[PDB]
Design an enzyme around this catalytic site. Sequence first.
Site, short mmCIF file in Angstrom:
data_model
loop_
_atom_site.label_atom_id
_atom_site.label_comp_id
_atom_site.label_asym_id
_atom_site.label_seq_id
_atom_site.Cartn_x
_atom_site.Cartn_y
_atom_site.Cartn_z
N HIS A 98 -0.38 1.60 -3.47
CA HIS A 98 -1.73 2.10 -3.57
C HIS A 98 -1.75 3.19 -4.65
O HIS A 98 -0.77 3.91 -4.83
CB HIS A 98 -2.22 2.67 -2.24
CG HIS A 98 -3.70 2.88 -2.19
ND1 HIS A 98 -4.30 4.02 -2.64
CD2 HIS A 98 -4.69 2.07 -1.74
CE1 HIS A 98 -5.61 3.92 -2.48
NE2 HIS A 98 -5.87 2.75 -1.93
N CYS A 106 0.82 -1.21 0.00
CA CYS A 106 0.00 0.00 0.00
C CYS A 106 0.86 1.26 0.00
O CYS A 106 1.39 1.64 -1.05
CB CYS A 106 -0.96 -0.02 1.19
SG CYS A 106 -2.37 1.07 0.97
#
Lengths: 188, 188
Positions: free
Chosen positions: A125, A105
């Site tokens: 992400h 992420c």
Amino acid sequence: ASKRALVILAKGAEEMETVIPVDVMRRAGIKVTVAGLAGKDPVQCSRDVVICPDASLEDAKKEGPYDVVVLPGGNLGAQNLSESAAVKEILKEQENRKGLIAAICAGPTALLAHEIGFGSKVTTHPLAKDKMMNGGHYTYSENRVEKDGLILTSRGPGTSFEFALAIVEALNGKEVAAQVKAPLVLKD
Amino acid sequence: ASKRALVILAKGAEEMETVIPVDVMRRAGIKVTVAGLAGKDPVQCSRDVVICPDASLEDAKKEGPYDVVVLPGGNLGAQNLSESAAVKEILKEQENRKGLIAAICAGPTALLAHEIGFGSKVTTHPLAKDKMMNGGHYTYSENRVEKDGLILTSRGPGTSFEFALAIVEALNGKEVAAQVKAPLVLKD
């Protein structure tokens, strides 16, 4: 004969991205140490879940080496990881001994901060892409899990299971990962 | 105007099935209380993740009512829930006021122990089916998430995201759930 994983836990970490890999890795028989960046004290995660680490990072550092170093995401957690000299030392050492480094992420932005794995294909992400790509030191991928050399990255909380099973496969092989996966009732 | 969720956390609970709904529900603006069954002290989960609850169940009981009561899974956690008189009282009260009750994996077997929701369609982890179906008091479903009246059940750790988003949809509606879902990078 037991593989060993270090999970670095800092305030603001995404608690789902921390617990899923820890859980799945222990299901695989991996010895996991959840190490608090700031010490042994409980860590308040990004959505106010409070986790007690197994040890301080300082103590866990002395009990290496680890087959994988895992960096969870969470924007504020990743920033804390990016600012820590202890994390820099751990990652550089892991890179030198050709150990696996795994980040999910926002976690991968800590690799940029510490100049780790330049030239590798990585994912983040979507909201962290611009930060990760500052300077063009990596090549960006939109795959849910990406592995290039010893750098394994993943995109978000919803990729945490695939991220964790990729670690298991890299360490313990494809059959163990498939065995661990079946009782989870994953869709694919 | 804020919806409120009670998550009951007992030793042996599946930590992924606890953290994912707590995280997702707080992302939805729901006020979540993670209540320790045994008190305010840290809870060792099934894969040795240790979570600090927000409150003891005794204190959380006094600050009701809750729009949803959430029972995580984990075989030993579900057994502890099944044996607790405090849980029985909370669930019977929730059933009487027609509040939502949500349980995942082995968690639903606590509904049988406390005679909650007989006649409802429910799902469990496949390994908990026989236990849940003792007496034929429910109708079994193999859907990843099942909702019948005020009883919402789900199958396993890998259904935790769908389980949690179903709670959000029931409480806050389909648009909020879709908004919360997009940043997670879920596959479907």
